[PDB]
Ligand binder design. Structure first.
Ligand SMILES: Nc1ncnc2c1ncn2[C@@H]1O[C@H](CSCC[C@H](N)C(=O)O)[C@@H](O)[C@H]1O
Ligand SMILES: [Zn+2]
Lengths: 96, 75, 175, 106, 82, 366, 95
């Protein structure tokens, strides 16, 4: 009947895959599973950060609280890599 | 004419600017010359403001003058 | 004592590391372990059997892929000039013949597995597989490696370079 | 004018900010939150997809089937620590046989 | 400081009594070391989350309510501190 | 080469170590111990040189002379003394009405030392006749001013505590150039300090607006009396807002390094692109005192809380260096064999950039 | 052929490589229909939905088996037994 427009993280992860391995194809099922994974991790981190922000009598969500959340949630040296990458991204973003 | 573009490291570059050539074209020529993007450069004459969307004749800078090319960041 | 000439002059030594201390799943995708997790389980120390050796500070049990041997792979025509240069420079018989048509020379290029010894009482046996269309030699163990022992594989030469190891079963020769 | 190119990332940032604003996680958020989230999602997606491509080229198949993703996630240890209680559709299981159950003879 | 001592601070009768409250009789003499090990590996995560929480709050003392908060973050909840 | 990528341990010959600095290319370490003594350690050789019984009250800063024969120390008890590198005793002794922040020796004038008195104008003390010459300043004379030489020490630059920077001559003292820092958007800002390099005449400025800025020591005498501020990159930390205590320049002239206070976040950038490249992973718990790279080779060495942490490039030559005609590499290609198979009577007699900060003449093998 | 225990290893490895489902579609669909009718009557199922449940089941179930496996190894035997299943179910913390 009436067509609808839906949002999925389809184009961006595909661009990432091409940026990394510009020789390998991807399946629709893999596309949907990656979409579910990114939605899952996004909601997990955002909710944990929000409930931490409520815990501290803070009415805001700064950037510091998110890095605290990713320090808690992410284990091992992957946490260090992710937090360093995030700091790089924000520093390269601000002066622009 | 001819003017000087002084950088931060200390190297001095001499370039030619016409009386009726806009600053944007000068920056494009510089970018095609040594590869430094125009977004990474801006003109300063003795600690005074110079913009990109203008022309040398609008500022009336004398010949053989030095311009402080104070470094910038990409984007 | 600077006035008496001591003997054992000629050495013809190349790897000048001889010390008196010596203080020691499907097939194709196992390539990673070759290059990344294969640089700690074995140390390089003074062998007691003969010359230098690969001692051990770790433990590896039976049926475990350990090392890939690589070197200057050449054809059999270069064997003549290679042996002449071995006689000239004083080079041992590093003619690692994977087959009668290709031999792995280890006098101008080679890997850390050039440090091995031979004995009729060894610890490991050889094996070869083929990955991605290329034939590569990888060794799988039959027993456990103890801390402080040296890797050695039987050359399987059917019965003059002596084999001085001191083992009771040691045939004293490459045979 | 766009906003993702300001930091050079690839994941959208305006979309993240809108979706977090309407997600009622709080009432007021700063400016670095959306870019930071886009960055961390970028890093995690790259981490997974590189192993996905490695597994794709393992079997010499261009298309990445979910079996490859299952193998890449399971064989790593940090992922198995982080993806503890999660399964995968059509994923299958990595091969494993218990050591003491291995018959042999002369 | 880092000291190998005080790790044996849980001497044998304490583990004896804990085993008794568990309801066991025959315990081999080589259980104590792995009990120490499992206790340490458990306590690591909770103390680490507690110190991260207290650090984020810009104070260098730890309360009990943040401790139970971290404990609930792992999944084991405490009742009786707020 | 590139930025340091390996980590080194500590270098603690004695338990306490407050300040550190390299001489010209990292020869000896000038440790001002918190006991009134002056200890000299050995760099690139991992040893000690000399211990000097200076006085009772400990010191807080150190630098060496242009000819390397003196050990100046910004004392905490106003002992402006010229300790000898050779004998270890005091050569010249003097007292200043205000303590000293930054001591330096002009690589072309060791007679006039660098002094940064507080609430008073900088004073050059001449070692030839023990005469003090006050540096003429502008406006206030009671501000927290810091004075420092340029690359060659030919011009001296001073920073005040209201927003004013002054430029004058190291010897003639012809104050003919000033500068007013930007006033943010509504409120003005003072200056904490400035720090120079050995190539390019660039210099970082640390202010009270929580933001580290960078200028060049060539746009003030060119503009004239006072112009408009125009930095290259207003670098800062926009996720934790760490204040800045001590930061030096690179050992090559193209990098910029900045130091934290307690967060163990040592940041690095390059002058060409203001994009972060790497961050240091330091163990929390200590306060950073001094940072200064190897003036030639990329390496980082930060002193803190009596100990020192070095992030470096540990290197050992490859096994394939036995001989140029001998290599120990791996290849799977067939070997490429070779394809091309006087009388004179003369005896033999033959045996960043460089500045004049040499001739320590301090080495005791026994 | 003969030598029982040899064919088991070949079968288990062959199936470990494979990654297909293991339950016939129609019987499982009818069972889900019955257990739904137990709760409420006249429920229309999405063909995608049923499939969903299906996969989850095997996941859960296979995990259980593996656990029982190691439990049998703890008892100095190879064959698994019902008692080991209650062992795993109780010790997992899900009774
Ligand atoms: N125990 C031994 N005594 C004499 N020759 C040996 C030997 N073990 C191995 N060889 C010979 O030495 C050749 C390799 S060179 C020996 C390895 C290395 N140079 C080392 O110091 O240990 C082989 O071709 C083999 O035939
Ligand atoms: Zn023998």
């Amino acid at each position: 009947r009436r067509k609808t427009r839906k949002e999925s993280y389809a184009i961006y992860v595909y661009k990432v895959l091409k940026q990394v391995h510009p020789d390998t194809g991807i399946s629709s099922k893999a596309m949907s599973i990656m979409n579910s994974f990114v939605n899952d991790v996004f909601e997990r981190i955002a909710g944990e950060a929000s409930r931490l922000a409520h815990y501290n009598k803070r009415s805001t969500i700064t950037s510091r609280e998110i890095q605290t959340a990713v320090r808690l949630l992410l284990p091992g040296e992957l946490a260090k890599h992710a937090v360093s990458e995030g700091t790089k991204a924000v520093t390269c973003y601000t002066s622009a | 004419m001819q003017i000087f573009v002084k950088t931060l490291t200390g190297k001095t570059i001499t370039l030619e600017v016409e009386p009726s050539d806009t600053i944007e074209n000068v920056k494009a020529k510089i970018q095609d010359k040594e590869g430094i993007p125009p977004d990474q450069q801006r003109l300063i004459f003795a600690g005074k403001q110079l913009e990109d969307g203008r022309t040398l004749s609008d500022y009336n800078i004398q010949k053989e003058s030095t311009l402080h090319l104070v470094l910038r960041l990409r984007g | 004592a600077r006035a008496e000439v001591h003997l054992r002059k000629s050495a013809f030594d190349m790897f000048n590391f001889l010390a008196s201390k010596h203080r020691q799943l499907p097939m194709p995708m196992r390539f990673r372990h070759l290059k990344k997790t294969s640089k700690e389980a074995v140390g390089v120390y003074r062998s007691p059997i003969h010359g230098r050796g690969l001692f051990c500070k770790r433990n590896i049990d039976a049926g475990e892929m350990v090392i890939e041997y690589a070197g200057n792979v050449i054809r059999s025509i270069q064997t003549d000039k290679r042996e002449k240069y071995y006689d000239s420079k004083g080079i041992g018989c590093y003619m690692f013949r994977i087959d009668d048509s290709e031999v792995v020379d280890a006098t101008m290029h080679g890997n850390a597995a050039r440090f091995i010894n031979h004995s009729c009482e060894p610890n490991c046996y050889s094996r070869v597989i083929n990955i991605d269309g290329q034939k590569h030699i990888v060794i799988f163990a039959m027993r456990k490696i103890y801390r402080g022992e040296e890797l050695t594989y039987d050359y399987k030469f059917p019965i003059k370079l002596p084999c001085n190891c001191g083992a009771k079963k040691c045939r004293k020769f490459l045979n | 004018k766009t906003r993702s190119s300001r930091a050079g990332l690839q994941f959208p940032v305006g979309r993240v900010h809108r979706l977090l604003r309407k997600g009622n996680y709080a009432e007021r958020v700063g400016a670095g939150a959306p870019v930071y989230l886009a960055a961390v999602l970028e890093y995690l997606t790259a981490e997974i997809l590189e192993l996905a491509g490695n597994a794709a080229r393992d079997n010499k198949k261009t298309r990445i089937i979910p079996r490859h993703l299952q193998l890449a996630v399971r064989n790593d240890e940090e992922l198995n620590k982080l993806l503890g209680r999660v399964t995968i559709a059509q994923g299958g299981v990595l091969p494993n046989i218990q050591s003491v159950l291995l018959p042999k003879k002369t | 400081k880092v000291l190998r001592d005080n790790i044996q601070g849980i001497t044998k009768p304490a583990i004896r009594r804990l085993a008794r409250r568990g309801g066991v009789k025959r315990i081999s003499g080589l259980i104590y070391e792995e009990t120490r090990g499992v206790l340490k590996v458990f306590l690591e995560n909770v103390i680490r989350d507690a110190v991260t929480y207290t650090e984020h709050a810009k104070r260098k003392t730890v309360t009990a309510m943040d401790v139970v908060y971290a404990l609930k973050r792992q999944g084991r909840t405490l009742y009786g501190f707020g | 080469q590139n930025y340091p990528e390996e980590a080194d341990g500590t270098l603690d010959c004695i338990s306490m170590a407050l300040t550190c600095t390299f001489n010209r290319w990292g020869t000896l370490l000038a440790v001002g111990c918190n006991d009134g003594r002056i200890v000299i350690w050995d760099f690139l050789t991992r040893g000690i040189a000399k211990i000097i019984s200076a006085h009772i009250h400990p010191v807080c800063s150190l630098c060496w002379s242009r000819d390397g024969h003196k050990l100046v120390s910004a004392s905490t008890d106003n002992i402006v003394s010229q300790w000898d590198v050779l004998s270890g005793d005091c050569d010249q002794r003097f007292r200043f009405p205000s303590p000293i922040l930054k001591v330096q020796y002009h690589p072309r004038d060791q007679n006039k030392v660098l002094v940064c008195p507080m609430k008073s104008a900088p004073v050059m003390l001449t070692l030839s006749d023990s005469k003090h010459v006050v540096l003429p300043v502008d406006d206030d004379s009671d501000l927290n001013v810091v004075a420092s030489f340029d690359r060659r020490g030919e011009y001296i630059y001073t920073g005040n505590a209201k927003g004013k920077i002054l430029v004058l001559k190291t010897d003639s003292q012809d104050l003919v150039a000033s500068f007013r820092v930007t006033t943010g958007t509504s409120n003005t800002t003072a200056i904490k300090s400035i720090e120079f390099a050995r190539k390019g005449s660039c210099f970082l400025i640390n202010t009270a607006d929580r933001i580290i800025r960078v200028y060049d020591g060539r746009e003030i005498l060119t503009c004239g009396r006072d112009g408009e501020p125009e930095p290259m990159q207003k670098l800062q930390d926009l996720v934790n807002r760490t204040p800045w205590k001590k930061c030096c320049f690179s050992g090559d002239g193209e990098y910029i390094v900045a130091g934290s206070a307690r967060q163990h976040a040592l940041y690095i950038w390059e002058k060409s692109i203001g994009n972060l490249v790497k961050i240091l992973h330091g163990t929390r718990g200590e306060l950073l005192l001094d940072v200064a790279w190897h003036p030639v080779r990329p390496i980082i060495a930060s002193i803190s809380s009596g100990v020192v942490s070095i992030w470096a490039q540990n290197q050992v030559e490859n096994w394939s260096a036995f001989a140029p005609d001998f290599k120990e590499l791996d290849e799977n290609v067939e070997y490429e064999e070779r394809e091309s198979e006087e009388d004179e009577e003369v005896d033999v007699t033959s045996v960043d950039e460089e500045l004049e900060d040499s001739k320590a003449l301090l080495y005791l093998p026994i | 052929r003969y030598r029982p225990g040899t064919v088991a290893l070949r079968e288990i490895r062959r199936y470990q490589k494979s990654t297909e489902l293991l339950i016939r579609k129609l019987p499982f669909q009818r069972l889900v229909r019955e257990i739904a009718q137990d709760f409420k009557t006249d429920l229309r199922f999405q063909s995608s939905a049923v499939l969903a449940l299906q996969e989850a089941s095997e996941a859960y179930l296979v995990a259980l088996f593996e656990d029982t496996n190691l439990c049998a190894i703890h008892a100095k035997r190879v064959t698994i037994l019902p008692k080991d299943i209650q062992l795993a179910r109780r010790i997992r913390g899900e009774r």
